[PDB]
């Protein structure tokens, strides 16, 4: 009931677009040390993606403004801009560490299926990647390495537990390829993964379900879009 009530609360917060509250509810669920349903998994990721996404957008805008002011030479403006960026970066670290902690202390140890393991390790990969987006120096290298290890773990489980057309496997390939390009600065590897994921899916496209076709085809073309853009460079 607590769980049933918690999940109903999250569905209200999602409807109201109050994602801090949706995170609060789904986090209590993940702490229960149980295998989550697909629905609960989606609720959890949506809550955290929205909380982090608002900050990621704020950070990019502020970073852009900081560059323009550095060119202009506004010393006082830059001091305020930097203070603002540091505050947003603090929020980013806190959100990421929260979900990363939940994943390592509850979700992964209780994970019961292959897709759910892939799902949780991909989340780990994503949120370490978000840390790396604004980290610098050693913190950056650790975040990148941690992201890489999580993504490789998910891939290793996926290559044996999910068909190459499975949407979670594809979404893993998409985010992992983005990591190679955007974090590791490896366009070669990024394209090789994206194309590999695209080809394995196309080879078994007959395995796609009518329902998975919508999600999978949209993902595979995001891979194609990334491929086109990355090859453009």
């Amino acid at each position: 009931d607590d769980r049933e009530d918690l999940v109903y609360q999250a569905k209200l917060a999602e409807q109201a677009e109050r994602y801090d509250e949706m995170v609060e509810s789904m986090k209590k669920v993940a702490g229960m040390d149980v295998e989550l349903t697909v629905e609960e998994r989606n609720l959890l990721s949506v809550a955290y993606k929205n909380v982090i996404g608002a900050r990621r957008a704020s950070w990019r805008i502020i970073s852009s403004i900081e560059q323009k002011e550095e060119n202009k030479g506004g010393e006082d403006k830059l001091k305020m801009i930097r203070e603002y960026r540091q505050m947003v970066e603090t929020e980013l670290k806190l959100i990421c560490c929260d979900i990363l902690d939940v994943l390592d202390k509850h979700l992964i140890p209780a994970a019961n299926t292959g897709e759910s393991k892939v799902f949780y390790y991909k989340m780990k990969g994503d949120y370490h990647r978000y840390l790396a987006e604004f980290a610098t120096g050693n913190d950056r290298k650790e975040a990148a390495e941690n992201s890489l290890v999580a993504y490789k773990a998910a891939s290793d489980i996926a290559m044996t537990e999910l068909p190459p057309t499975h949407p979670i496997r594809l979404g893993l390939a998409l985010n992992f390829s983005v990591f190679y390009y955007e974090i590791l600065n490896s366009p070669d590897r990024a394209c090789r993964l994206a194309k590999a994921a695209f080809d394995d899916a196309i080879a078994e496209l007959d395995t796609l379900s009518e329902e998975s076709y919508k999600d999978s085809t949209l993902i595979m073309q995001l891979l194609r879009d990334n491929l086109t853009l990355w090859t453009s460079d």
Partner: peptide, 7 residues
């Protein structure tokens, strides 16, 4: 711009 998995 590059794009990752949507929500």
């Amino acid at each position: 711009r590059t794009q990752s998995l949507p929500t």
